[PDB]
Structure formats: structure tokens, C-alpha cells
Symmetry: C2
Subunit: 122 residues, 2 copies
Amino acid sequence: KVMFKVPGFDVLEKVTLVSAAPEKLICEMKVEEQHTNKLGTLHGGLTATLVDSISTMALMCTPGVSVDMNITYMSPAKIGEEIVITAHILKQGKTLAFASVDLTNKTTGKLIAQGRHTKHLG
Amino acid sequence: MSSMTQNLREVMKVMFGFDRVLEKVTLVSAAPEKLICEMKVEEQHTNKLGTLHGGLTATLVDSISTMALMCTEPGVSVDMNITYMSPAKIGEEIVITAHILKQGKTLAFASVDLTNKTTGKLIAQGRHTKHLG
């Protein structure tokens, strides 16, 4: 689905691309120098923020304020890797909505991190 | 040639202590990374309001993601988080499924989802990190 994720000017690291269904929301990003941490592997500074938006992003399609968010990291991503990022509206409820993102390594398949996120509507 | 599903069915029934709260709990299926279980919510499972209780829904995430852990190549808990989308009422039959997301030299991670057996509908999604102590 064609448009693109054009909230991206002024905390904003869109360097990220796409593929949009209902309650689901693929994107992709190539880890670069700016994205990374003390080591080479993008830290979850970025990852978090990435789960924040693209969740919220994937949601302004069906937008709220954050509430709770949690992230578990399980694989590094190196500078130079290209990664995909899947978002899935889990629940859309009256006052609250729930969403769950998966960040994998494209080349590898391998799961990098996985984080859930709740926001408040109204 | 492997009777992992059968076999877990006994390890479980032996070890269900606090875990003895999980007696009405069936195993439907035991893969080497996914695990399925069901459980009709009773009333000794229930909350203050008659839905399934918060704690037990975590107890079901701890234990059953740990069961899961025993299939492949146990631990201790590191962290857990759990999110609640929908009430499981009395009489309900719930499927609980577990996913080992990750392997690891000293840590293992798994995700678990509670579904309505009949709606299909989500109840709670949980994520559980253990240390391979």
C-alpha cells in the first residue's frame, strides 16, 4: 500500500521504507553509523523509538499517546545489516490499543528484538 | 518416533507446590519450539470480578514457557512482562501457546499468547526471559 510514512521531518530517523496491510506493517532500515551505539550494533535507543513509531505509525491508518512499552533484545544488528520491522495491531479497543512489533534481520531471518506497546486513545 | 507430546503430558502431571495451581491444565501439543495447552477457566482461577485472574495468567506464562524450555536441548526467571487485552470469563476454554523466540548460551526467551479457544480472540500475550542457571 502506496503513500509512505511521510511524518518524517524534525526526533526522526526515518531512513526507513515499507509494506502496508490491515492491522500489520512492514518496514526496513540499513544500519548506519548514526544508528549504531559504542559498538557497531544499533542500540535499542533506536530500536525502542522504532517500536514506538511504526506502531503508532501503523495505527494512524486504522494515533494515541504512549502508555506502556517493553522491549526484549535477542540479537545484535551490525552496521551494514539490513533489517525488517513488522508491526501488528493486536487490539483496537475503545480507549486503548495494543501492538506488537518484531524486528528481524532480513539477510539472516534472525530475530533481533521484539517489543509490545500500548497507547492511549483519548 | 517421538512421543514428546505424550511425554510432557506426564512430566507436567507429576509436577503439578505453587505449580499445583495448574491442575486443570491440559497439554494439547509439544513441538521442539512451540507448545500448546488448554484450560477451561473455573472459578478458583478467577479474579475479583469473575474473569481469569492476573496472577494466574502470569503463572500460566512462567510455567508453560518453562515447560517449553524442556523439549529442546529450564532456568530461572529474569524478567517477565504481560499485557491484557480481553477478560476470560467462567466457563471459557482458553488455549495457551508458547514460542521459544530464542536459544542463547546463557539466556532463553519466549513469548506466550492466551487465546479464546472459540473466538480465537486475544487475551493476553506475555514475554518471559530466563537465565539458563
